[PDB]
Amino acid sequence: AECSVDIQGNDQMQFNTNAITVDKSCKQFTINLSHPGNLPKNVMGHNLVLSTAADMQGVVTDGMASGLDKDYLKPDDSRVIAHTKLIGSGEKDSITFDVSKLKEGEQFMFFCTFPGHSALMKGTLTLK
Ligand SMILES: [Cu+2]
């Protein structure tokens, strides 16, 4: 199966998918994030961050408090499974992670931790 997806985050706080499926036969999986907006990352920065459903808002909350200098992620946050960098207008970033870090049956989420964004910028990730 394929083991990559391309996702965009825009100037109206939206990702271009609501749900990511990872094929259970993948060993690694790569997420190619890009920002087709025009706004700087200072006001419209996006990352794509993975965690369990339960852990998402703790990551978001602690992340908000951590500043642009830390990509709006609390340092050494063990709840984060994998993530891109935080990017602004016209940038792109890709991450490849071990799919062994995910498990069938488990409800994962992807989201952006930039202050305020998660309200809209989130979706499910499922190993299937
Ligand atoms: Cu964002």
UniProtKB/Swiss-Prot annotation:
Cellular component terms per the entry's GO annotation: periplasmic space; plasma membrane
Classification via CDD domains: Azurin
Descriptive protein name: Azurin
Function: Transfers electrons from cytochrome c551 to cytochrome oxidase.
Pfam family, one: Copper-bind
Protein's UniProt keywords contain Metal-binding: yes
Residues at which Cu cation binds: H46, C112, H117, M121
Bridged cysteine pairs (disulfide): C3-C26
Top-level taxon in the UniProt lineage: Bacteria
Gene Ontology terms, MF aspect: copper ion binding; electron transfer activity; identical protein binding; transition metal ion binding; zinc ion binding
Keywords: Copper, Disulfide bond, Electron transport, Metal-binding, Periplasm, Signal, Transport
Plastocyanin-like domain residues: 1-128
UniProt organism field: Pseudomonas aeruginosa (strain ATCC 15692 / DSM 22644 / CIP 104116 / JCM 14847 / LMG 12228 / 1C / PRS 101 / PAO1)
